[PDB]
Design a binder for this molecule. Structure first.
Ligand SMILES: CNC(=O)c1cc(Br)c[nH]1
Length: 114
């Protein structure tokens, strides 16, 4: 089974759009964390592989995922980064947990279809 880049994009894009639709919960995740701008120099000492929704979308728009599990890996990487860096009751952590719930509720039938 080989995937065509625009077909893979059409199949997965609704799952990414569902994350983007969440307001306010997608807001911390719509752009890359910039530790200098945010004044959190420790960020890249804990998060070695940053990921965010804008980067996932760009990868999905430019054929960077050959297989659907590569996309699923990047979504979970974004989540796991936030769950490692932030306090459990912080806004970012709580918002992350909402996005992961949305992602769970949705990604199963899409993967079954691929
Ligand atoms: C995904 N964003 C974060 O994990 C983050 C930004 C700031 Br400021 C603290 N945590």
């Amino acid at each position: 089974k080989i995937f065509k880049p625009e077909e893979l994009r059409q199949a997965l894009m609704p799952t990414l759009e569902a994350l983007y639709r969440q307001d306010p919960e997608s807001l911390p995740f719509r752009q890359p964390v910039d530790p200098q701008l945010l004044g959190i120099p420790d960020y890249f000492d804990i998060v070695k592989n940053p990921m965010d929704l804008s980067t996932i979308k760009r990868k999905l728009d430019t054929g960077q995922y050959q297989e659907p599990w590569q996309y699923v890996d990047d979504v979970w990487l974004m989540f796991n980064n936030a769950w490692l860096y932030n306090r459990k009751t912080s806004r970012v952590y709580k918002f992350c947990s909402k996005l992961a719930e949305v992602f769970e509720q949705e990604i199963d039938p899409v993967m079954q279809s691929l």
